Coordinates of C-alpha atoms and ligand atoms in Angstrom, one line a residue:
Chain E
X29 CA 0.0 0.0 0.0
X30 CA 1.3 3.4 -1.3
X31 CA -0.7 6.3 -2.8
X32 CA 1.0 8.9 -5.0
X33 CA -1.6 11.6 -3.9
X34 CA -0.2 11.5 -0.2
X35 CA 3.5 11.8 -1.4
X36 CA 5.1 15.2 -0.5
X37 CA 7.5 17.4 -2.5
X38 CA 11.2 16.6 -1.6
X39 CA 12.1 20.3 -1.2
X40 CA 13.8 21.0 2.1
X41 CA 13.9 17.2 2.9
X42 CA 16.2 15.8 0.2
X43 CA 18.5 17.3 -2.4
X44 CA 20.4 15.8 -5.3
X45 CA 24.2 16.1 -5.5
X46 CA 25.8 14.1 -8.5
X47 CA 24.5 11.3 -10.8
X48 CA 26.0 7.9 -9.7
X49 CA 24.2 5.9 -12.4
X50 CA 20.8 4.7 -13.6
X51 CA 18.3 1.8 -12.8
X52 CA 15.9 -0.2 -15.0
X53 CA 14.1 3.2 -15.5
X54 CA 15.4 6.5 -14.1
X55 CA 18.7 8.0 -13.0
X56 CA 20.3 7.3 -9.6
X57 CA 21.7 10.4 -7.8
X58 CA 23.9 10.6 -4.7
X59 CA 21.5 12.6 -2.6
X60 CA 21.7 14.3 0.8
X61 CA 19.1 14.6 3.7
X62 CA 19.1 18.4 3.9
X63 CA 18.6 18.7 7.8
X64 CA 21.4 16.2 8.7
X65 CA 23.7 16.2 5.6
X66 CA 23.4 12.4 5.6
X67 CA 23.9 10.7 2.2
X68 CA 21.1 8.8 0.6
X69 CA 20.7 7.3 -2.9
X70 CA 17.9 9.0 -4.8
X71 CA 16.2 7.2 -7.8
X72 CA 14.6 10.0 -10.0
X73 CA 12.0 8.5 -12.4
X74 CA 9.5 10.3 -14.7
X75 CA 5.9 9.4 -13.9
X76 CA 4.3 8.8 -17.4
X77 CA 2.0 6.3 -19.2
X78 CA 2.5 2.5 -18.3
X79 CA 5.6 3.6 -16.1
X80 CA 3.0 4.9 -13.6
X81 CA 2.3 1.4 -12.4
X82 CA 5.9 0.1 -13.0
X83 CA 7.5 2.7 -10.7
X84 CA 4.5 2.3 -8.2
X85 CA 5.4 -1.4 -7.9
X86 CA 9.2 -0.8 -7.1
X87 CA 8.0 1.4 -4.2
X88 CA 5.9 -1.4 -2.6
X89 CA 8.7 -4.0 -2.9
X90 CA 11.5 -1.7 -1.7
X91 CA 9.3 -0.5 1.3
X92 CA 8.3 -4.0 2.5
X93 CA 11.4 -6.3 1.7
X94 CA 14.4 -4.0 2.3
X95 CA 14.4 -4.6 6.1
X96 CA 17.5 -6.9 5.8
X97 CA 21.2 -6.1 6.2
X98 CA 21.9 -7.5 2.7
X99 CA 19.3 -5.3 1.0
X100 CA 19.7 -1.4 0.7
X101 CA 17.1 0.1 3.1
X102 CA 14.1 2.1 1.7
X103 CA 13.9 5.6 3.4
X104 CA 11.0 7.2 1.6
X105 CA 9.3 8.4 -1.6
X106 CA 8.5 11.9 -2.9
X107 CA 7.0 13.7 -6.0
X108 CA 8.6 16.9 -7.4
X109 CA 5.4 17.9 -9.3
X110 CA 6.1 19.5 -12.7
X111 CA 3.3 21.2 -14.9
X112 CA 0.1 19.1 -15.3
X113 CA 4.5 15.1 -16.2
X114 CA 5.8 14.8 -12.6
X115 CA 9.1 13.4 -11.2
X116 CA 9.3 10.7 -8.5
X117 CA 12.2 10.6 -6.0
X118 CA 12.7 7.1 -4.5
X119 CA 15.0 7.4 -1.5
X120 CA 17.1 4.7 0.0
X121 CA 20.4 3.9 1.8
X122 CA 23.5 5.2 0.0
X123 CA 26.3 2.7 -0.7
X124 CA 29.4 4.8 -0.9
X125 CA 32.0 2.3 -2.3
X126 CA 29.9 1.6 -5.4
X127 CA 29.1 -1.6 -7.3
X128 CA 31.1 -4.8 -7.3
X129 CA 31.5 -4.2 -11.1
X130 CA 33.3 -1.0 -10.2
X131 CA 35.4 -2.9 -7.6
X132 CA 36.8 -5.6 -10.0
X133 CA 37.2 -2.8 -12.7
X134 CA 39.4 -0.8 -10.2
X135 CA 41.5 -3.9 -9.2
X136 CA 44.9 -4.9 -10.8
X137 CA 44.3 -7.7 -13.3
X138 CA 40.5 -7.2 -13.0
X139 CA 40.1 -10.2 -10.6
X140 CA 39.3 -10.4 -6.9
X141 CA 40.9 -12.8 -4.3
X142 CA 38.8 -16.0 -3.9
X143 CA 38.0 -15.3 -0.2
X144 CA 36.6 -11.8 -1.3
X145 CA 34.4 -13.7 -3.8
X146 CA 33.3 -16.1 -1.0
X147 CA 32.3 -13.2 1.3
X148 CA 30.5 -11.2 -1.4
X149 CA 28.6 -14.3 -2.8
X150 CA 27.4 -15.3 0.7
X151 CA 26.1 -11.7 1.3
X152 CA 24.2 -11.8 -2.1
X153 CA 22.9 -15.3 -1.1
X154 CA 21.7 -14.1 2.4
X155 CA 19.8 -11.1 0.8
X156 CA 18.4 -13.6 -1.8
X157 CA 17.2 -16.0 0.9
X158 CA 15.3 -13.1 2.6
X159 CA 13.6 -12.2 -0.7
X160 CA 12.8 -15.8 -1.6
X161 CA 11.1 -16.5 1.9
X162 CA 9.0 -13.4 1.2
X163 CA 8.1 -15.0 -2.2
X164 CA 10.1 -12.4 -4.2
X165 CA 12.5 -13.1 -7.1
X166 CA 15.0 -10.3 -7.7
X167 CA 15.3 -11.1 -11.5
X168 CA 18.3 -8.7 -12.0
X169 CA 21.2 -10.1 -10.0
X170 CA 24.4 -8.7 -11.5
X171 CA 27.6 -7.0 -10.3
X172 CA 26.0 -3.6 -11.1
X173 CA 23.1 -4.3 -8.6
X174 CA 25.5 -5.5 -5.8
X175 CA 26.8 -2.5 -3.9
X176 CA 29.3 -1.9 -1.2
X177 CA 29.2 0.6 1.7
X178 CA 32.3 2.5 3.0
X179 CA 32.6 -0.3 5.7
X180 CA 32.6 -3.3 3.2
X181 CA 28.9 -4.2 3.8
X182 CA 27.2 -5.9 0.8
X183 CA 23.7 -4.7 -0.2
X184 CA 21.2 -5.6 -3.1
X185 CA 19.5 -2.9 -5.1
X186 CA 16.9 -2.4 -7.9
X187 CA 13.4 -3.9 -7.7
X188 CA 12.7 -2.5 -11.3
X189 CA 12.5 -6.0 -12.9
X190 CA 11.4 -7.9 -9.7
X191 CA 8.4 -10.2 -9.4
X192 CA 9.3 -2.4 -18.2
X193 CA 9.2 -2.1 -22.1
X194 CA 13.0 -2.4 -22.5
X195 CA 15.0 -5.6 -22.3
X196 CA 18.2 -5.0 -20.2
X197 CA 21.6 -6.7 -20.3
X198 CA 21.4 -10.5 -21.0
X199 CA 24.7 -11.8 -19.6
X200 CA 23.5 -12.7 -16.0
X201 CA 20.2 -14.2 -17.3
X202 CA 19.3 -17.8 -16.5
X203 CA 18.5 -20.1 -19.5
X204 CA 14.8 -20.5 -18.3
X205 CA 14.2 -16.7 -18.3
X206 CA 14.9 -16.6 -22.1
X207 CA 12.0 -17.6 -24.3
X208 CA 12.7 -20.2 -27.1
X209 CA 11.0 -23.1 -29.1
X210 CA 10.9 -25.5 -26.1
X211 CA 10.5 -22.6 -23.5
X212 CA 7.7 -20.3 -25.0
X213 CA 6.4 -18.8 -21.7
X214 CA 10.0 -18.3 -20.2
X215 CA 9.5 -19.7 -16.6
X216 CA 10.9 -17.5 -13.8
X217 CA 11.4 -19.5 -10.5
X218 CA 13.5 -18.2 -7.5
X219 CA 16.5 -20.4 -8.7
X220 CA 16.9 -17.9 -11.6
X221 CA 18.7 -15.6 -9.1
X222 CA 21.1 -18.3 -8.1
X223 CA 22.3 -18.7 -11.8
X224 CA 22.7 -14.9 -11.8
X225 CA 24.6 -15.1 -8.5
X226 CA 27.1 -17.6 -10.1
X227 CA 27.6 -15.4 -13.2
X228 CA 28.3 -12.5 -10.7
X229 CA 31.0 -14.8 -9.1
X230 CA 32.6 -15.4 -12.5
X231 CA 32.4 -11.5 -13.0
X232 CA 34.3 -11.0 -9.6
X233 CA 36.9 -13.7 -10.7
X234 CA 37.5 -12.5 -14.3
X235 CA 36.2 -8.9 -14.4
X236 CA 33.4 -9.7 -16.8
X237 CA 30.6 -12.2 -17.2
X238 CA 30.9 -15.1 -19.7
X239 CA 30.0 -14.2 -23.3
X240 CA 30.9 -10.4 -22.6
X241 CA 32.7 -10.4 -26.0
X242 CA 29.3 -11.4 -27.7
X243 CA 26.7 -8.9 -29.1
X244 CA 23.9 -8.9 -26.4
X245 CA 21.4 -10.4 -28.9
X246 CA 23.8 -13.2 -29.7
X247 CA 24.5 -13.9 -26.0
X248 CA 20.7 -14.1 -25.5
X249 CA 20.6 -16.8 -28.2
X250 CA 23.6 -18.7 -26.8
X251 CA 22.8 -18.8 -23.0
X252 CA 20.0 -21.4 -23.4
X253 CA 22.0 -23.4 -26.0
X254 CA 25.5 -23.4 -24.4
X255 CA 26.7 -25.7 -21.6
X256 CA 27.1 -24.2 -18.1
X257 CA 29.8 -21.4 -18.2
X258 CA 33.1 -22.3 -16.5
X259 CA 36.0 -20.3 -15.0
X260 CA 38.9 -19.8 -17.5
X261 CA 41.8 -20.2 -15.0
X262 CA 42.8 -23.5 -13.2
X263 CA 44.2 -21.5 -10.2
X264 CA 40.9 -21.5 -8.3
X265 CA 40.1 -23.9 -5.5
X266 CA 38.0 -27.1 -6.0
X267 CA 35.4 -25.6 -3.6
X268 CA 35.1 -22.5 -5.9
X269 CA 34.6 -24.6 -9.1
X270 CA 32.0 -26.7 -7.2
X271 CA 30.2 -23.4 -6.1
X272 CA 30.2 -22.1 -9.8
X273 CA 28.9 -25.6 -10.9
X274 CA 26.2 -25.4 -8.2
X275 CA 24.9 -22.0 -9.3
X276 CA 25.2 -22.8 -13.0
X277 CA 23.1 -26.0 -13.3
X278 CA 21.5 -25.5 -16.8
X279 CA 18.2 -27.1 -15.9
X280 CA 16.7 -25.1 -13.0
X281 CA 14.7 -28.2 -12.0
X282 CA 18.0 -29.8 -10.7
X283 CA 19.5 -26.4 -9.5
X284 CA 20.0 -26.2 -5.7
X285 CA 17.9 -23.8 -3.5
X286 CA 19.3 -20.6 -1.8
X287 CA 19.3 -22.6 1.5
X288 CA 21.3 -25.5 -0.1
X289 CA 23.9 -23.1 -1.6
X290 CA 24.3 -21.2 1.7
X291 CA 25.6 -24.6 3.1
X292 CA 28.1 -25.0 0.2
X293 CA 31.7 -25.3 1.7
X294 CA 32.8 -22.3 -0.4
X295 CA 30.0 -20.1 1.3
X296 CA 29.7 -21.9 4.7
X297 CA 33.5 -22.3 5.5
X298 CA 35.1 -18.8 5.7
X299 CA 37.9 -18.7 8.3
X300 CA 39.5 -15.4 7.1
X301 CA 36.1 -13.6 7.1
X302 CA 37.2 -10.8 9.5
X303 CA 40.5 -10.2 7.6
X304 CA 38.7 -9.9 4.1
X305 CA 36.3 -7.3 5.7
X306 CA 39.5 -5.4 6.6
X307 CA 41.2 -6.1 3.2
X308 CA 38.0 -4.9 1.3
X309 CA 37.7 -1.8 3.5
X310 CA 41.4 -1.0 2.8
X311 CA 40.8 -1.5 -0.9
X312 CA 37.9 1.0 -1.1
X313 CA 40.0 3.6 0.7
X314 CA 43.0 2.8 -1.6
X315 CA 40.8 3.8 -4.6
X316 CA 41.4 7.5 -3.7
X317 CA 41.9 9.2 -7.1
Chain R
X4 CA 32.7 21.5 -38.6
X5 CA 34.4 18.1 -39.2
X6 CA 32.6 14.7 -39.1
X7 CA 35.9 12.7 -38.7
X8 CA 36.4 14.7 -35.5
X9 CA 37.0 14.1 -31.7
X10 CA 38.0 17.7 -30.8
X11 CA 37.0 19.5 -27.6
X12 CA 33.6 21.3 -28.0
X13 CA 35.0 24.7 -26.5
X14 CA 34.4 27.6 -28.9
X15 CA 32.2 25.4 -31.2
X16 CA 29.2 24.3 -29.0
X17 CA 28.0 24.7 -25.4
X18 CA 25.2 23.3 -23.2
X19 CA 22.5 26.0 -22.7
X20 CA 20.6 23.7 -20.2
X21 CA 21.5 21.9 -16.9
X22 CA 25.0 20.1 -17.0
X23 CA 23.8 16.6 -15.7
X24 CA 22.8 9.3 -22.2
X25 CA 20.5 12.3 -21.6
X26 CA 20.0 15.0 -24.3
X27 CA 20.4 18.7 -23.5
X28 CA 19.5 21.8 -25.5
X29 CA 22.7 23.4 -26.8
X30 CA 23.9 26.0 -29.3
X31 CA 26.6 26.9 -31.9
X32 CA 29.0 29.4 -30.2
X33 CA 29.7 31.5 -33.3
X34 CA 26.1 31.6 -34.8
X35 CA 23.8 31.1 -31.8
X36 CA 22.0 28.3 -33.8
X37 CA 20.0 25.8 -31.7
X38 CA 21.1 22.2 -31.5
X39 CA 20.3 18.9 -29.8
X40 CA 23.3 17.5 -27.8
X41 CA 23.5 13.9 -26.4
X42 CA 26.0 13.5 -23.5
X43 CA 27.6 10.2 -22.4
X44 CA 30.3 9.2 -19.9
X45 CA 33.0 7.4 -21.8
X46 CA 36.0 5.4 -20.4
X47 CA 39.6 5.5 -21.9
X48 CA 39.0 2.2 -23.8
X49 CA 35.6 3.5 -25.0
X50 CA 37.3 6.6 -26.6
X51 CA 39.5 4.2 -28.6
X52 CA 36.3 2.4 -29.9
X53 CA 35.1 5.9 -30.9
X54 CA 38.3 6.4 -32.9
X55 CA 37.8 3.1 -34.8
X56 CA 34.1 3.8 -35.4
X57 CA 35.0 7.3 -36.7
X58 CA 37.1 5.4 -39.3
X59 CA 33.9 3.3 -40.1
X60 CA 31.7 6.4 -40.7
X61 CA 30.0 6.8 -44.1
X62 CA 29.6 10.2 -45.9
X63 CA 26.2 11.8 -46.6
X64 CA 25.0 15.3 -47.2
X65 CA 22.2 17.3 -45.4
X66 CA 18.7 16.2 -46.2
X67 CA 15.4 17.9 -45.3
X68 CA 14.1 14.7 -43.7
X69 CA 17.2 14.0 -41.5
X70 CA 17.9 16.2 -38.4
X71 CA 21.5 17.0 -39.5
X72 CA 24.3 15.2 -37.4
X73 CA 27.0 17.8 -36.8
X74 CA 29.7 15.7 -35.2
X75 CA 31.4 14.1 -32.2
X76 CA 33.2 16.1 -29.5
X77 CA 34.9 15.1 -26.2
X78 CA 34.6 17.3 -23.1
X79 CA 37.6 16.6 -20.9
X80 CA 37.8 15.8 -17.1
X81 CA 41.0 15.3 -14.8
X82 CA 43.5 12.5 -15.9
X83 CA 41.9 9.2 -14.6
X84 CA 38.3 10.5 -14.8
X85 CA 35.4 9.6 -17.2
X86 CA 35.3 12.1 -20.0
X87 CA 32.0 12.9 -21.7
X88 CA 31.2 12.2 -25.4
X89 CA 29.1 14.9 -27.2
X90 CA 26.9 14.1 -30.3
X91 CA 25.4 17.2 -31.9
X92 CA 22.4 17.3 -34.2
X93 CA 19.8 19.9 -35.7
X94 CA 17.2 20.9 -33.2
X95 CA 13.5 19.9 -33.8
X96 CA 11.4 22.1 -31.6
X97 CA 7.9 20.3 -31.8
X98 CA 9.2 16.9 -30.5
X99 CA 8.5 13.3 -31.6
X100 CA 5.7 11.8 -33.7
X101 CA 5.0 9.6 -30.5
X102 CA 4.3 13.0 -28.7
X103 CA 2.1 13.9 -31.6
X104 CA -0.1 10.7 -31.3
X105 CA -0.1 11.0 -27.4
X106 CA -1.4 14.6 -27.6
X107 CA -4.3 13.5 -29.9
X108 CA -7.8 12.4 -28.9
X109 CA -8.2 8.6 -29.0
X110 CA -4.4 8.3 -29.6
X111 CA -4.8 7.9 -33.4
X112 CA -3.8 10.1 -36.3
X113 CA -5.8 10.9 -39.4
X114 CA -4.9 8.5 -42.3
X115 CA -3.6 11.5 -44.5
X116 CA -1.3 12.5 -41.6
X117 CA 0.1 8.9 -41.5
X118 CA 0.6 9.1 -45.3
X119 CA 2.5 12.4 -45.1
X120 CA 4.6 11.4 -42.1
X121 CA 5.5 7.9 -43.5
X122 CA 6.6 9.4 -46.9
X123 CA 8.9 11.9 -45.1
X124 CA 10.4 9.0 -43.0
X125 CA 10.8 7.1 -46.3
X126 CA 12.5 10.0 -48.1
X127 CA 15.0 10.4 -45.2
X128 CA 15.6 6.7 -45.3
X129 CA 16.2 6.7 -49.1
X130 CA 18.9 9.3 -48.6
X131 CA 20.6 7.2 -45.9
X132 CA 20.2 3.9 -47.9
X133 CA 21.6 5.5 -51.1
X134 CA 24.7 6.5 -48.9
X135 CA 24.9 2.8 -47.7
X136 CA 23.7 3.6 -44.1
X137 CA 21.0 1.8 -42.0
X138 CA 19.2 3.9 -39.5
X139 CA 18.7 0.8 -37.2
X140 CA 16.2 2.6 -34.8
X141 CA 13.1 3.7 -36.8
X142 CA 10.4 4.3 -34.2
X143 CA 8.0 7.2 -33.4
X144 CA 10.3 8.6 -30.7
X145 CA 13.1 8.9 -33.3
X146 CA 10.9 10.7 -35.9
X147 CA 10.9 14.5 -34.9
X148 CA 8.9 17.6 -36.0
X149 CA 10.2 21.1 -36.4
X150 CA 8.3 24.4 -35.6
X151 CA 7.2 24.5 -39.3
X152 CA 5.8 20.8 -39.4
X153 CA 8.9 19.4 -41.2
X154 CA 9.5 15.7 -40.5
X155 CA 13.1 14.8 -39.6
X156 CA 14.8 11.5 -38.6
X157 CA 17.0 11.5 -35.4
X158 CA 20.7 11.3 -36.4
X159 CA 23.4 11.2 -33.7
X160 CA 25.9 9.5 -36.2
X161 CA 23.7 6.6 -37.4
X162 CA 26.5 5.3 -39.8
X163 CA 28.8 4.3 -36.9
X164 CA 26.1 3.8 -34.1
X165 CA 28.2 6.0 -31.6
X166 CA 25.2 6.6 -29.3
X167 CA 24.7 2.7 -29.2
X168 CA 28.2 1.3 -28.7
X169 CA 29.4 3.2 -25.6
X170 CA 28.0 3.7 -22.1
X171 CA 26.3 1.1 -19.8
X172 CA 23.2 1.1 -22.0
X173 CA 25.3 -0.2 -24.9
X174 CA 25.1 -3.9 -23.6
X175 CA 21.3 -3.7 -23.2
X176 CA 19.0 -5.3 -25.7
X177 CA 16.6 -2.3 -25.8
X178 CA 12.9 -2.0 -26.7
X179 CA 11.9 -4.9 -29.1
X180 CA 8.6 -3.6 -30.6
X181 CA 9.9 -1.9 -33.8
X182 CA 12.5 -4.7 -34.4
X183 CA 12.4 -6.6 -37.7
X184 CA 12.3 -10.5 -37.5
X185 CA 15.9 -10.7 -38.9
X186 CA 17.5 -8.5 -36.3
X187 CA 16.3 -11.0 -33.5
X188 CA 18.5 -14.1 -33.1
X189 CA 16.5 -17.4 -33.0
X190 CA 16.7 -21.1 -34.1
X191 CA 16.7 -20.4 -37.9
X192 CA 18.5 -17.0 -37.5
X193 CA 21.5 -17.7 -35.1
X194 CA 23.1 -14.4 -36.3
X195 CA 21.3 -11.1 -36.4
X196 CA 21.4 -10.1 -40.2
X197 CA 20.9 -6.3 -40.2
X198 CA 20.0 -4.9 -43.7
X199 CA 18.7 -1.6 -45.1
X200 CA 15.2 -3.2 -45.4
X201 CA 15.1 -3.6 -41.6
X202 CA 14.2 0.1 -41.5
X203 CA 11.2 -0.5 -43.7
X204 CA 9.7 -3.1 -41.3
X205 CA 10.3 -0.4 -38.5
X206 CA 8.5 2.1 -40.8
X207 CA 5.4 -0.2 -41.0
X208 CA 5.5 -0.6 -37.1
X209 CA 5.8 3.3 -36.8
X210 CA 2.7 3.6 -39.1
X211 CA 0.7 1.2 -36.8
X212 CA 2.0 3.3 -33.9
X213 CA 0.6 6.5 -35.6
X214 CA -2.7 4.6 -36.2
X215 CA -3.2 3.0 -32.8
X216 CA -0.9 5.0 -30.5
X217 CA 1.3 2.0 -29.7
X218 CA 3.3 -0.6 -31.7
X219 CA 1.8 -4.2 -32.1
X220 CA 2.5 -6.5 -29.0
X221 CA 2.8 -3.4 -26.7
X222 CA 0.7 -5.4 -24.1
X223 CA 3.4 -8.2 -24.1
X224 CA 6.4 -8.4 -21.8
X225 CA 9.4 -7.2 -23.9
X226 CA 11.1 -10.7 -23.7
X227 CA 7.8 -12.4 -24.9
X228 CA 7.5 -9.8 -27.8
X229 CA 11.1 -10.6 -28.8
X230 CA 10.2 -14.3 -28.9
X231 CA 6.9 -13.6 -30.9
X232 CA 8.1 -11.1 -33.6
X233 CA 10.1 -13.8 -35.6
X234 CA 7.3 -16.4 -35.0
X235 CA 4.1 -14.5 -35.6
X236 CA 2.8 -13.7 -39.1
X237 CA 3.1 -10.0 -40.1
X238 CA 1.3 -7.6 -37.7
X239 CA -2.0 -6.1 -38.9
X240 CA -4.1 -3.0 -38.0
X241 CA -6.8 -3.8 -35.4
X242 CA -9.6 -1.6 -37.0
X243 CA -11.3 -2.2 -40.3
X244 CA -12.0 1.6 -40.8
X245 CA -8.6 2.1 -42.7
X246 CA -8.4 2.4 -46.4
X247 CA -7.4 -0.6 -48.6
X248 CA -4.3 1.5 -49.7
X249 CA -3.2 1.8 -46.0
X250 CA -3.6 -2.0 -45.3
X251 CA -1.5 -2.6 -48.5
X252 CA 1.2 -0.2 -47.3
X253 CA 1.4 -1.9 -43.9
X254 CA 1.5 -5.3 -45.7
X255 CA 4.3 -4.0 -48.0
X256 CA 6.5 -2.9 -45.1
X257 CA 5.8 -5.9 -42.9
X258 CA 7.0 -8.7 -45.2
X259 CA 8.4 -11.3 -42.7
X260 CA 11.4 -12.4 -44.8
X261 CA 13.5 -9.3 -45.6
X262 CA 14.8 -11.0 -48.9
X263 CA 11.2 -10.6 -50.1
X264 CA 10.6 -7.1 -48.6
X265 CA 10.5 -4.1 -51.0
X266 CA 13.2 -1.4 -51.2
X267 CA 12.7 2.2 -50.0
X268 CA 12.3 3.3 -53.7
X269 CA 9.6 0.7 -54.3
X270 CA 7.7 1.8 -51.2
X271 CA 8.0 5.5 -52.2
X272 CA 5.9 4.6 -55.3
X273 CA 3.2 2.8 -53.1
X274 CA -0.3 4.5 -53.8
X275 CA -0.6 5.3 -50.1
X276 CA 2.7 7.3 -50.2
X277 CA 2.7 8.4 -53.9
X278 CA -1.0 9.6 -54.1
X279 CA -1.5 12.5 -51.5
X280 CA -4.0 15.1 -52.8
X281 CA -4.6 16.8 -49.4
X282 CA -0.8 17.2 -48.8
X283 CA -1.0 21.0 -48.5
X284 CA -4.0 20.9 -46.1
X285 CA -2.2 18.2 -43.9
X286 CA 0.9 20.5 -43.7
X287 CA -1.5 23.2 -42.3
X288 CA -3.4 20.7 -40.0
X289 CA 0.0 19.6 -38.5
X290 CA 1.2 23.3 -38.2
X291 CA -2.1 24.1 -36.4
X292 CA -1.4 21.3 -33.9
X293 CA 2.2 22.6 -33.1
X294 CA 0.7 26.1 -32.4
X295 CA -2.3 24.8 -30.3
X296 CA 0.1 22.8 -28.1
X297 CA 2.6 25.7 -27.8
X298 CA 0.8 27.0 -24.6
Ligands
3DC5 C1 18.2 1.4 -6.9 C2 19.4 1.9 -6.5 C3 20.5 1.9 -7.4 N1 21.8 2.5 -7.0 C4 22.3 2.8 -5.8 N2 21.6 2.5 -4.7 C5 22.2 2.8 -3.5 N3 23.4 3.3 -3.3 N4 24.1 3.5 -4.4 C6 25.4 4.0 -4.5 C7 25.8 4.0 -5.8 C8 27.1 4.3 -6.2 C9 28.2 4.7 -5.4 N5 29.2 5.0 -6.2 N6 28.9 4.8 -7.5 C10 27.7 4.4 -7.5 C11 24.7 3.6 -6.6 C12 23.7 3.3 -5.7 C13 20.3 1.4 -8.6 C14 19.1 1.0 -9.0 N7 18.0 1.0 -8.2
MG6 MG1 11.2 -10.2 6.0
MG7 MG1 18.3 -3.3 4.8

């Protein structure tokens, strides 16, 4: 429950600073709570035709399901009314260190240490488990939607695709979400996010998802046809290969649940957990340029 | 003005709107002439891609049906920061043809308006096609009107696709509704085979958009529409009110197999496009709309 009629103007409450990206629909600004100076991420979306119900939906999911440490917390919603085509500001917790895509991009050799991948993946999985118990599928798990705070906390964003008129990036999409001759009605199940989580792990390991060198339309054709993607390097632990294999089961019917993957030795057994939190924290401060 | 450029925009153009893929109203420094400027954050590797794509650019003159592409500029930022790519084009004050059908009762345009607009799109396309260029994104949002009811095609360097190869939005599939069956990869088309006739399918979808306010399959999830476009027979107009000539035009554009689709020149001779007796009155009817909405 949320009505656009009750929603106040953001003037004096929140102000925009600089653009830090975009979502499914609308630009994402680094915002500031006027009275305290506290940073907040502001999603500014134009309320138009069809988008009126699409943006309204994101508000209800963000409001009700962001009450977990691994999901960026919903603060509030506002409408900066323009002549009778308005602008909606969706305010949530700011994640200072940026996306995990940005992390691997700003790392020597565009790869992260295996124990960093283990920590990040578990945090994605924990946020996913919370959504899945609440009968919610994220539907857009990718490094761009996995953000870090200044204190190396991992948080999930964007309920823009969650269960518009544009098809986004295909590389993190599970085979079953792509419609083809033997799969006409797609078939989104919660396990679709686990495939996406595995592709995000290859992204942390190699700096890019598998098939990144393909035209997006060609990758969309290949994902359901190709065998499960594999890590290029042999350096990785047997536990990491097994985790990737676990996430990337082609047929979602034999793919493990979020709960099963949370018990995977790669996720479950993390002895250097405290040190990687320090290492990661140190790395985000090191990126001072 | 050089079209094989990458120079800094200082002294040539400037943003006469808020600083910050969004498009801002700009102007030529020396003349004060209005322009449309697209601004994108580009990486160091992305600027190299731009250099190569500038080498791939085809040459073509100004045309009354193409909002003139002026060039590519780079606005610098400190060393190690994301510079911004500038793509400059002729300004079209009255907005898109989608805006035109949205600001019309019952979200439909008069058949003679559809005939005039389609012919203008076709004329701009013929100019690009004769110069070995595919527009690749013919849709109502990319067909603009000037203050004087002139129809112009959006061009931010269509011969190299500079606004579609850089930025985060470059790896996205995009909206599927105006896509021709051959541009969508499927079982019998494992490779997206783009051709000049792909714009002609888009032209038929833009005509249904002018007629119904939305493209066919608009009610479908974009992923489902992408699966249906190559599988479904050619889309058709819902209403039976339309002239036989209009149905034939739609049918002409929307030939499923592009190998069997007519050329821009053939479609320019179609009775729906060729025979326009109320052309003068339509140019007045459209000019009247621009003025009525200018308040
Ligand atoms: C909702 C939120 C969203 N983005 C962000 N949400 C929250 N915090 N945040 C920090 C950065 C960021 C920091 N540095 N660079 C980008 C970007 C964001 C995207 C889509 N939907
Ligand atoms: Mg809960
Ligand atoms: Mg939370």
